[PDB]
Design a protein around this nucleic acid. Structure first.
Ligand SMILES: Nc1ncnc2c1ncn2[C@@H]1O[C@H](COP(=O)(O)OP(=O)(O)OP(O)(O)=S)[C@@H](O)[C@H]1O
Ligand SMILES: [Mg+2]
Lengths: 404, 48
DNA sequence: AAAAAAAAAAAAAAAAAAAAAAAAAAAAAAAAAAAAAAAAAAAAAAAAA
DNA sequence: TTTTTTTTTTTTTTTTTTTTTTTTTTTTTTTTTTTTTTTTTTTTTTTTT
């Protein structure tokens, strides 16, 4: 009988070996051939905030040192992002993990979870993270997590850079099981070695994910077969959170459009709550279902966790000029005001261009594209004022949630 | 054409209306004019 | 050590194209009227109760 | 003096041709929004006093 459907299943194969090809050419085509945006003595002022006098003093102190400054084709000064973070390293400006006021802090775990497909969590959240990383005055050690097995956050120009030299790896899955060589114990040095990777920024870091992570849900069903205390919830907490809380301060986490055991652990173990969403009716209805589903499930999780300290909703794909969606936003501000961000993330062709070349808004400048300037200008400025207002929620709660 | 028919073998009742009515009106004026040409050169035919 | 001159830059102004809206025209009907065609009710004629 | 049949009046019904009106689709049409080239403004270095 299933002669032609041996043909047909091994022709889903004889097409996904051609898609194995296709990914080979995708890798060959994405390859970097780019330079990071320069600060032009005014963009430097706007972004870093260093005064011209102190900047001159520091760049001279470094100029007499080993490193040499560089200039554009014109004698006008131009300093690269690498040179930027180097001058920050040598600025002596301490971070939240070096400030005498507060240096022994735990991670500020920030998450982006929506149960609605394709509406913006990936792109908006990676944009938000790369913008928060623009806080060069403070050198945040940031961990981007692409917990969505299909996110491009390991590939999208803030990526998990798995060069050819990269030998082997053990994803969050294998941290949920300790499937590394049984002889070696998973210590934080191992975590730097094969879990924490750079993102072409000397400050921003990441974790990668893989479609094999979907097998985690099957293994969790198997564990429910072998367990009944729902103890897999704490598997994340001890394996990952206790091992990472010692030596980082922020962890960007994308989770995916889905609500699943993996995403249940992401929800629970995390000590902060953010809720991405759009202004559409059905989306907010799904959020209603979400607000019914949670409380009982949190009751299911161990009583040791005293609930998440703050809850806020997000906009996205917000055209800002459609009557229905602004009415929805008004209703949200009417119901959970002070627990929803005011900031708006608009949609424009500039984001499309950014995505198609994979390059985040910061990676490209006006010369790269057309005059979708002010659109990108107000996009990055809303994302940065939104980053400081979410981090100001976190500031006012650096009394509460750090002591629980 | 498609129905393998001719212009005349279907009548107005066959169904258009004014459309086909003017259709055969024009076709039948063209036939008058044509067959008049037919005399005009047919008198030449009888004599060759 | 400072001034002036020279060179690589953003902001404003001008022109054209694609979105949309209203009106008009070709058409394409379902309904009615007029004319035409196919049968019918009082009167008339001849041979005969 | 009566009866029968046929040729004229008129009456009834139907089809075809030709009457009007409405809706749908197609064509010409400026306002608003979007795109590209640009003249003015800002920054740095070298040379001279
Ligand atoms: N500003 C934007 N401009 C253009 N496309 C956008 C924008 N924001 C979101 N998108 C759409 O989002 C797609 C990829 O981004 P995401 O929406 O994050 O996908 P995602 O990971 O499923 O997140 P969700 O489920 O939509 S919230 C793009 O291919 C677009 O279709
Ligand atoms: Mg997604």
């Amino acid at each position: 009988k299933r002669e032609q459907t041996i043909e047909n299943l091994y022709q889903l194969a004889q097409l996904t070996q051609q898609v194995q090809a296709d990914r080979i050419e995708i890798v060959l085509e994405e390859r970097r051939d780019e330079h990071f945006p320069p600060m032009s003595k005014a963009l430097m002022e706007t972004r870093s905030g260093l005064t011209r006098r102190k900047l001159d003093e520091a760049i001279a102190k470094m100029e007499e040192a080993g490193h040499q400054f560089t200039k554009n084709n014109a004698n006008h000064y131009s300093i690269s992002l690498s040179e930027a973070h180097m001058l920050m390293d040598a600025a002596g400006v301490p971070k939240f993990h070096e400030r005498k006021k507060n240096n022994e802090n735990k991670p500020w775990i920030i998450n982006v979870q929506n149960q609605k497909g394709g509406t913006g969590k990936s792109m908006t959240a990676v944009h938000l993270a790369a913008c928060l990383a623009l806080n060069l005055d403070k050198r945040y050690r940031i961990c981007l997590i692409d917990l969505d097995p299909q996110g491009s956050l390991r590939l999208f120009l803030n990526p998990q850079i798995s060069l050819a030299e990269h030998t082997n790896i053990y994803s969050a899955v294998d941290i949920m099981l300790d499937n590394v060589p049984d002889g070696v114990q998973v210590d934080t040095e191992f975590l730097r070695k094969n879990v924490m990777l750079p993102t072409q920024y000397p400050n921003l870091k990441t974790i990668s994910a893989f479609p094999e992570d979907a097998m985690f849900n099957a293994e969790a069903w198997q564990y429910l077969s072998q367990n009944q205390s729902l103890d897999i919830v704490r598997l994340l907490k001890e394996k990952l959170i206790d091992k990472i809380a010692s030596d980082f301060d922020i962890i960007m986490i994308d989770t995916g459009p889905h609500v699943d055991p993996l995403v249940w652990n992401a929800m629970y173990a995390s000590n902060a709550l953010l809720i991405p969403c759009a202004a559409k009716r059905l989306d907010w209805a799904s959020t209603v279902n979400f607000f019914q589903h949670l409380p009982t499930v949190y009751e299911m999780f161990p009583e040791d966790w005293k609930g998440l300290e703050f809850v806020r909703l997000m906009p996205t794909m917000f055209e800002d000029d459609n009557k229905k969606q602004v009415s929805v936003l008004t209703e949200m501000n009417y119901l959970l005001g002070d627990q929803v961000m005011m900031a708006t993330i608009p949609r424009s062709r500039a984001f499309e261009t950014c995505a198609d070349t994979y390059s985040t808004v910061f990676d490209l400048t006006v010369n790269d594209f057309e005059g979708g300037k002010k659109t990108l200008a107000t996009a990055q400025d809303a994302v940065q004022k939104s980053a400081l207002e979410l981090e100001r929620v976190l500031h006012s709660h650096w009394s509460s949630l750090n002591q629980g």
